[PDB]
Design a protein around this ligand. Sequence first.
Ligand SMILES: [Ca+2]
Ligand SMILES: [Ca+2]
Ligand SMILES: [Zn+2]
Length: 548
Amino acid sequence: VKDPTLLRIKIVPVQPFIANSRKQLDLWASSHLLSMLMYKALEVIVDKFGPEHVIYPSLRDQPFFLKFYLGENIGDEILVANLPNKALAIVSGKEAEKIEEEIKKRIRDFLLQLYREAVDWAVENGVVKVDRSEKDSMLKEAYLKIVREYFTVSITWVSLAIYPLLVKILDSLGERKVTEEGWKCHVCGENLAIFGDMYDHDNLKSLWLDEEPLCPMCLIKRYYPVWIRSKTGQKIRFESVVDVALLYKNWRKIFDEKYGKDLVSKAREVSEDFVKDNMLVDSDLYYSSTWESGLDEEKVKEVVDFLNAAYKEIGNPPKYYAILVMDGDDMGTPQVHVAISQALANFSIREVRSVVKDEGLLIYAGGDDVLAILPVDKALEVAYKIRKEFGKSWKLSAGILIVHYKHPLYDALEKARDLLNNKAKNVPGKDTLAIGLLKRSGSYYISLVGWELIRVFYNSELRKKLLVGKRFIYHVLREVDTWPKVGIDEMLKFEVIRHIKEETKELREKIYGEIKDLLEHVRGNNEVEKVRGLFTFLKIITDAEVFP
Ligand SMILES: [Ca+2]
Ligand SMILES: [Ca+2]
Ligand SMILES: [Zn+2]
């Protein structure tokens, strides 16, 4: 209509914006902000035409639009990032470039507004710990330039059966129109820290919240959650990975319910600086080790002892958490495009949220992609359920990295990604879950399994009987360390007999059967690889440091 023309928007950071996150809050803010940029982009198209002009993503149920456009109060549903960094729409030929420069302008202006607000906020609350009339010093054109040039917005359009050809034309010409375009800070470390020119290093570090001289973009990342709290009334329930870890078997709920106030008291009794608003200032303070180590001694001893007694009664505290990353297999005629986009939107916005919350933290769900932080006891069932919904609403691969709470976030993320792309997606036929466990010890276990293994195993008397040995797993694992000379079946039978009341005839009978079934859904070229994968999986889910 009015010279119908297909338009494509691609927003990309010139640095690994999201991937550089040093903290859970930073990851959430990264993703949320990207989705937000795309929101501003799309606001122009909606303003000029309307929501039905945007083919992908479908705006039908989009929380950012319901909240920021229509003013509906959706509450905490605003906290998930649902908008991808790529979009296409139908517009009239004449509006095209106008829309282009308007989208660019609105994104620039939005980012600059956030930078300004964020500097005010930094000075007022003293993250930058310098004098209030030195605000101007931070608006020095260098920093603004960094904020302006950080995101590349590629807008392309072509005039309008062969539609599927010109969509890829826009993919191409767009992948063209993108590429052409002191001491760097302590979070990302790609770009210059603020005051990273004028001052000298050791001196510089002391200007900052704790020894951490943010760049303008990381400054923005840090303000953004208070900004969102301003606009909405909402903030993510779990601020750090430890708050997610602690949801294992309701550990933190239970501890809170019984010993919580006492713990806050003994913590405060150590120092008023460990407590804010009648709760621990950092959740890693639920760990004895944090007191025995990190960074009055008799009061800290009192706390350590109180916690240790607590563990004896309620069980040891979970230190591990799971990163779930999922991507649709082999995914890259307008009616069917709209129907596809509506199906993807409904998967992303409704189904995924429906399974995840409140059991964990859903960071991003958009297109064929999911990113989420989960307690270790929920990861498998959540992954599985999301795959089921995807198949109801067609294949999907996932990496799951189970990791120690002290592990650097960005490295854990790079690893989860690496499980997804470099492992699961290199299986013939794909449709695979790749599970990693990285122990604090530095030891790393991987198991590649088909989605059905989770079902079959959940339904098995074997799972039940494992909560018959943990030494069993160790023994057959030491058998497939390098292969058994007698072969795989003989080895299994033997170790089963060994690790198991004539009634056991049944048990050994059944278990050996189930195992065989399970070996069906473990990925590998040969039976020994399948046994290694399956028993690595079992070692992973039986691990007592990981599952206390
Ligand atoms: Ca894909
Ligand atoms: Ca993807
Ligand atoms: Zn930075």
